[PDB]
């Protein structure tokens, strides 16, 4: 299959972190499809369609745990699919994968900032607002609060150990908010005087738990010891439909050398081993809304957005499987 | 006065953290101490007893939270106090310093040992530790019970900022103990499987709360949620006589520079600011023990503790006081 | 502009309490509405929908916390702003408004009259119950037990500032039942010997946070303390629609002259300040059922409700914005 | 009416619990129900259907907790009712009976087949389950879990007073898992050693409680304690309709001597009673998911369930009613 | 038999609560006891004794719950009884009993004072500190913050149904110290914003729970809910000597004509019945800190104060006792 | 050593439970060494002093948790010793044990009545109380309440797999109680109408754990969710020396044949275990007072107990170790 080198190319970026952030991934794997049709040389209309689902295979194979990216491959083949089938020529199906890649991505755009709009009614002037890594989801929500003149401060984890809290506070303080930043150890510390927390996620399952960030749910967990309203601001696709048949979400294992640098690590005894996991499990006992671009509701509501939205598609297998 | 080299150096060297641990540091106060009296030039008695009063005092203004410190700098002091105010003569009082110091010092040793011998005998064969920080205490109970045969491991948070889980890490390996590393974020993450958590403490006050490195708190949070015993290994002098009458324990607040280094912060907006709290506060229902080098005590025996053995000099000044 | 006096004097009376009860005042609303439109004397559709328009802003603006009022107005205006709309003539609309208002106060009746039904079968013989303000649906829910000779002794907690537990106690008292009457401030010590707490609301959110009469939330409290079922009676028009969207509830402030008598307060201090909230908010996790005329569900099925019955409406402005 | 010989013995093969287990004497109840139409001698439809109402009587008036009973006989009656109210002749009414109950036989098996297959994907290898009772759904999770290579231990509690455990122990034993047995009292003791509880229901009522075998509440509350995630495997036709409206489920109170035999119990004094309550409530906050044959849902969607499936019957009277 | 007036005037002032608070009636108690003997015409030690007794026993039946005023007539009578039994003439029994008594006054009013400088320390700049009717102890706290320069403000509960919360809203305020006033039901509402929470005892037992006015429990639920550290503020002769051999402290229930006017409260019918219990017990899990004038002291250490100080004198009967 | 048959046959009853009890085995191992001391032959001290160390040693090898026996043991032992160490003759010596012997028993009988006298306090008219097991000196409790005219009633739990509940429900209905007799699975059932939990010890810890009855951790544990009081009844002898220099006690684990009989466990496959331990470890949270011959005090002041009356012996190796 001729597979084009932007999606060799995005894959390796998504398994790099180069590209990053659970709805951004997801983004650029709709971009790479899109671009696999656009500048495909394929003739026959099987031909298409074989580039496509192994381009889709290339990118499912990079990060597992995010279901984001799944879900935007699965916009896009399920559309590709239904046309393949139905006979469409070269050219339709062409045109079907481009024009789903665009969907998903506009979506994508539309829904991070209803999440802002939605979430920022819940923000009240003068509020301390706590977050986690760098999630644009959650971003949106304080960015627009603050928009709307509401004087917010904002306690920024830097989220080891790929440090994308730093990514956060300099991302914050650009648009004019104020930003206290500290280590990930300090959240119970400053819980106190915090009054609302507020993060993202890879992946909701269909009980209401919440799979984001490692260390998540250690913030969560004192937060509600601390009557602090815990916030998660998540898309749609970030809800995983497998799930509601029994499947358990994979939890990435990254490289050690994230944790120590490879000059200090070999030089490390055998018996040590580094462990890093890049996410962790937050259980809906800790979270009292997530912020869809569809509104607000308690996590035990995840059930429902996977019903209405992506049940239908478990009967079938996975509409890039040959 | 004429305040000796190593009076200085050691100060720098706990302000700096070169030296630091909050029983290492109370024995190099007493060491600095020693040495004043060992190199006095004084001939008078008032004239030595000056020195001490002044070299206490540069000694306790060095970092603010392990009462470690000046417990060390009293016992020493309450000593040379009253042999001077029993007018001893410049070598009695010259050997009442340095002994009171020499004896201090010992004692820490002996007691770190102790600690190590009864806390060894609550871990079981198999067990999973974790630990926070590096504390000479709560490693001793590790080594004692590894060397007892028990085949255990030792989960080593990173402890951000100042990375003291790398000190912990390799001095448990160095031992033959396996080990490992994680962030601290992780800690959660990894509770199910740990069945001890052992760390240390800075300071305990009369109501049974442990001051301990930043981040202490949330691991203890989180032990206590998932039922895994915290024992706190302490020495009688980790216990802090002004809280019996209300004091509250100052929090020291350390450089940002710490978190993030001077060439990255002076690029970063000024809406930015970093706080870097070296303590937290780990209240008494989420620990299980704190192992004295007297015994086992829940954590409400602290106020025990301290009346017994502390409680007595609350009713005078400083011993190093004019 | 020609907006009758029965409006004006409905408006007042909301305002000042001498009409209260969140099911009591969303009836009287209707009830203003409707005779704005019987007595009109607009002589084209344009007119009287001015009049109900500017009418249904005066009964708005009266009291913000519960949204059974705004629900209320909304069910009426719905009704004649889509009449309006599709051409109606004057006595099409006139009679569009009346009857829209008297379904609605039938429907409320009927409403309230089911959830004693459905609540009663959650009551045992035997059991104390506790309550408190007045709520009529909590009420027909202890009545209604009373009336299927179950022996039940209600506990009326006195509700400060305005004493609506005098109201309840007297009521209940008139239908036989036994009534113990305690200050609010004894709800704990008698929460041993009760066996299940009936309360009404207010306004109930998106995430299943219920909105009633400052001091629910530390009978709830106490009652999950205390493994004590929280039984929360509420018509459907009790839940709050713009809560889907992120919109806060807010809390009436009342006159401190309500807790202070103006006589006793005019002779008090500068520096002292009475604040008066007249509701609080309860969370979900201390909530049992919510007993709706469709029946019983949990807190966090509350969005169920608003999205099926209300959720529709939130794509376009009040029907009686212009 | 002239009620068949295998009516009788099977009614009389649940109360003694002969027959037992929620979701077995459902199909035993349908398959009565198919017996009596077989060999029915009636000769008008008006008749047949006056056996089937009489042998529904007899079949549900049997044990009152588990609601699958009831539900059985609904499936069939409502089926039988419907065709006989339409104008059906004898054949059709027959047929009707026997079809009705030999499609609820068969759901109810494949039922159990496919809550294994999900339930099982939350099994890992290397996990200890502690179970409760004698649940064939939850045999049919750790059976498949198995039977996929995950090498698994299971706890079975001994389940007095009927020891059901033993016919879980020796079961699971046979399919070549292994078990470990222990008497109810020591779950606790073993919780910190158990990954994961899975357990069975007789009835689960809107507000997402489980009413399982007494001793359930207790294990699922120590589970909870020891953050060990609480599964219950259970049919949807183990969900109960009337708690929709608000009815209360009956617990059984089953004979005294099955505590203290006879022999033992008449010599004992006249002030000692024996209660042996043979089910608990365990409420949905310590119920991590329930695994239906239409997937995972968290407790608090038990109230879907019945709405999406049960709803729509609780307008008309039981469809074995005069 | 032969008792002054002014024993009999100060019972009548204690049983109405025209003198209240546990301190002060204590006080006044020793106050009543030293002008009986000021005041005697007895000619003999017996004649004395039997009045000395005699007004104990008065005294001692006032009111129940606080054992401050029974630990005042014994610290007089185990004195005076001392004297008597080794043989003291008329004079020296006479004066025994006035200086006892004002040792008693003496010592409550440096306790009061002491207590204020340790619970201070306590209390930090910009504190809201949430309070509970009207304690001298918590208040001296209150107000040594504000001699101190620290700006508190302090929420001022109304406390039903005698209104002690107005005395202290008009006492802290007269001292400067700004005041938020709220009605008991606003605790939870407010405890958000509340940095601490400062309450007195009437009576505290050996295994650490504070009996204090009614609604004490709920504040002190709702703050450990929150984190926010609960204060009780409280002398040496608030313990209660009889809990440490298992004696349980009395409620004292208060006339239903404080709850609900005479001229109100004869109208009403028959079947309310108005309970009026004067105090609460609060759980030593919900306290932080007891501040007695000897230190700080987590509750579960209140079986130390009570067996070094009072824990002798349970071997003997009353000492007014014959 | 020439050892009495009353030795071994005690040994063996222990061992085998025909006596059974915590203090009563105690009392038993002092009994059988006064009989030891009484027949033997010795001529010389040391010869005795040989038979009752190896007497002693037999005794302390029967059963390991309860740590009465050890103490028991420890009483006459210690006062032997020092007698033979400080040169006794003969008769001296057989006097030290037989005397030590009968003061151990008799302060036994008399602590167990005053837990009795001491806990009665604590039962108010009416109360309804739950137990475990069969603890004399819980039952100490209960009879003496009932013997001052409380009506009380008793919830009793079976107590697998020996049935010591069929003991406790024949006790307490022959002094007139009357009896509820439950499995032990159905203790939180049962415990929204228990207002108290009155169970005994093995061995008390220094940080305030109880080890007691397998199950007794699971009815505390849920007493505590529901707000009922938890009293431990408990001799000075129950509490455990060795625990405060960090000793683990030893959980028995008693053959499974109790669990299941013999001729039915033969029968069984072997891939199954049957585990049966006879003890679990309450934590001091879910305990609110033990009740001791000395008083009432937290689970907390334990260590007090401990420390006070055992520390001392420490520091020395067991007085019948050679
Ligand atoms: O979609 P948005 O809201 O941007 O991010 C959501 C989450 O994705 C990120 O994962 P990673 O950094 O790619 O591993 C973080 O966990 C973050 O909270
Ligand atoms: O005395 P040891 O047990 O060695 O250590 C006690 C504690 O002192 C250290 O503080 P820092 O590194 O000096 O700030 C850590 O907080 C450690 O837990
Ligand atoms: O609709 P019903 O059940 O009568 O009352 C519901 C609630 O409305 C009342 O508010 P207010 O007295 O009007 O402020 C109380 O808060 C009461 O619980
Ligand atoms: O339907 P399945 O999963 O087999 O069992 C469900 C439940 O029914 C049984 O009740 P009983 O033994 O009939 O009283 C047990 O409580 C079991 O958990
Ligand atoms: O001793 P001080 O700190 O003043 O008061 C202690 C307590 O006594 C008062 O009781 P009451 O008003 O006499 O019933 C209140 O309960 C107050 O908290
Ligand atoms: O000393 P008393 O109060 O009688 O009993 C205390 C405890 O000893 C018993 O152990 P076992 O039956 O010998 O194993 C039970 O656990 C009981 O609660
Ligand atoms: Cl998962
Ligand atoms: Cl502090
Ligand atoms: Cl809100
Ligand atoms: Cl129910
Ligand atoms: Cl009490
Ligand atoms: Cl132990
Ligand atoms: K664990
Ligand atoms: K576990």
Same mark, same amino acid.
């Given at each position: 299959?001729?597979?084009?080198?932007?999606?060799?190319?995005?894959?390796?970026?998504?398994?790099?972190? $180069?590209?990053?952030?659970?709805?951004?991934?997801?983004?650029?794997?709709?971009?790479?499809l899109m671009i696999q049709a656009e500048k495909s040389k394929a003739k026959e209309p099987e031909e298409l369609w074989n580039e496509l689902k192994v381009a889709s295979?290339?990118?499912?194979?990079?990060?597992?745990?995010?279901? #984001?990216?799944?879900?935007?491959?699965?916009?896009?083949?399920?559309?590709?699919?239904?046309?393949?089938?139905?006979?469409?020529?070269?050219?339709?199906?062409?045109?079907?994968?481009?024009?789903?890649?665009?969907?998903?991505?506009?979506?994508?755009?539309?829904?991070?900032?209803?999440?802002?709009?939605?979430?920022?009614?819940?923000?009240?002037?003068?509020?301390?607002?706590?977050?986690?890594?760098? #999630?644009?989801?959650?971003? #949106?929500?304080?960015?627009?609060?603050?928009?709307?003149?509401?004087?917010?401060?904002?306690?920024?984890?830097?989220?080891?150990?790929?440090?994308?809290?730093?990514?956060?506070?300099?991302?914050?303080? #650009?648009?004019?908010?104020?930003?206290?930043?500290?280590?990930?150890?300090?959240?119970?510390?400053?819980?106190?005087?915090?009054?609302?927390?507020?993060?993202?996620?890879?992946?909701?399952?269909?009980?209401?738990?919440?799979?984001?960030?490692?260390?998540?749910?250690?913030?969560?967990?004192?937060?509600?010891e601390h009557r602090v309203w815990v916030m998660i601001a998540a898309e749609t696709y970030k809800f995983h439909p497998a799930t509601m048949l029994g499947q358990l979400?994979?939890?990435?294992?990254?490289?050690?050398?994230?944790?120590?640098?490879?000059? $200090?690590?070999?030089?490390?005894?055998?018996?040590?081993?580094?462990?890093?996991?890049?996410?962790?499990?937050?259980?809906?006992?800790?979270?009292?809304?997530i912020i869809t671009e569809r509104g607000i509701i308690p996590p035990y509501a995840a059930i429902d957005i996977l019903k209405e939205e992506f049940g239908w598609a478990?009967?079938?297998?996975?509409?890039?499987?040959?």
């Open positions: 299959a001729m597979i084009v080198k932007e999606v060799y190319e995005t894959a390796e970026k998504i398994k790099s972190m $180069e590209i990053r952030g659970a709805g951004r991934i997801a983004r650029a794997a709709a971009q790479a295979k290339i990118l499912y194979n990079t990060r597992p745990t995010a279901v #984001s990216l799944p879900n935007a491959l699965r916009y896009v083949m399920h559309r590709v699919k239904a046309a393949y089938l139905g006979g469409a020529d070269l050219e339709t199906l062409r045109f079907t994968a481009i024009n789903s890649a665009k969907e998903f991505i506009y979506n994508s755009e539309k829904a991070i900032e209803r999440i802002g709009e939605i979430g920022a009614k819940r923000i009240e002037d003068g509020d301390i607002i706590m977050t986690h890594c760098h #999630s644009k989801a959650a971003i #949106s929500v304080m960015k627009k609060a603050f928009e709307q003149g509401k004087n917010i401060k904002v306690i920024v984890t830097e989220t080891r150990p790929k440090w994308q809290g730093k990514i956060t506070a300099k991302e914050l303080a #650009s648009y004019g908010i104020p930003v206290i930043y500290i280590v990930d150890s300090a959240a119970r510390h400053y819980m106190k005087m915090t009054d609302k927390v507020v993060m993202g996620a890879n992946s909701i399952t269909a009980n209401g738990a919440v799979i984001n960030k490692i260390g998540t749910s250690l913030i969560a967990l004192t937060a509600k979400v994979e939890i990435e294992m990254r490289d050690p050398t994230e944790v120590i640098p490879e000059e $200090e690590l070999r030089t490390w005894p055998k018996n040590i081993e580094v462990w890093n996991p890049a996410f962790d499990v937050t259980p809906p006992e800790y979270i009292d809304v478990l009967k079938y297998k996975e509409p890039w499987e040959d």
